[PDB]
Amino acid sequence: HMTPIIHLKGDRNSLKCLRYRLRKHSDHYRDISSTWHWTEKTGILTVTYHSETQRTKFLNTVAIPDSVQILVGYMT
Amino acid sequence: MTPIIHLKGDRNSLKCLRYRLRKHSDHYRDISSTWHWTKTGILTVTYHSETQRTKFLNTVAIPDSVQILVGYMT
DNA sequence: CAACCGAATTCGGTTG
DNA sequence: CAACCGAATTCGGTTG
Known part of the structure; x- marks a missing residue:
């Protein structure tokens, strides 16, 4: 139960719009x-x-x- | 990693819970x-x-x- | 890459 | 414990 992850930090609207892009090829995560x-x-x-x-x-x-x-990093 | 806990449930229910959790913020x-x-x-x-x-x-x-x-995270 | 659009969602705080 | 409330924020998709 050691899941590989990453944390993307920055402008909230920027991260939201980025997610939209990351989700265009959801096979990479x-x-x-x-x-x-x-x-904060x-x-x-x-x-x-x-x-x-x-x-x-x-x-x-x-x-x-x-x-x-x-x-x-990782999470559980 | 840092020790954590994930609290799953109704979203408004959680929001109100956090509000309360802030009353004993000496333990997190x-x-x-x-x-x-x-x-x-x-x-x-x-x-x-x-x-x-x-x-x-x-x-x-x-x-x-x-x-x-x-669990743990990061 | 993100400022922007209108709407749905979430916020702290209240109230029962 | 969370439905509620007024108000701020976040959302998916668009556009330049």
């Missing part, structure tokens, strides 16, 4: 979260993956705006 | 907004420590309509 945040003016997009291979591909072929920050 | 690090994966909602609660999370679970009141899930 398991699922994407709604645009959330901690209760920035938002957060959570993306999970079925495997290191799937996540690895995503990071090699998916364009993330320089405005968005990328954080690689 | 931070609480997230009400989110979901793209009818039910999710609240993510992080903790300063493993023991802090335990004291939270045994002190805070979680609605039977809200599933509690222990």
Whole structure:
């Protein structure tokens, strides 16, 4: 139960519009979260993956705006 | 990873729960907004420590309509 | 890549 | 514990 993920951080509307784009080819990830945040003016997009291979591909072929920050990690 | 808990349930139900959780914020690090994966909602609660999370679970009141899930993240 | 559109959703806070 | 309330935010899709 160690899921590979990444956290995309940046403007809330920006992350939302990005999600829209990431979801055009939903085969490169398991699922994407709604645009959330901690209760900070920035938002957060959570993306999970079925495997290191799937996540690895995503990071090699998916364009993330320089405005968005990328954080690689895991959850349970 | 950081010790956390995911609280699943009605989204408005969760929002109101977070409001309440803030009354005893001495036993948790931070609480997230009400989110979901793209009818039910999710609240993510992080903790300063493993023991802090335990004291939270045994002190805070979680609605039977809200599933509690222990885990780690980031 | 994100500012923008109208609408549905979520927010803190209240009330019962 | 959450239906409710007024008000702010977030949403999917569009557009430049």
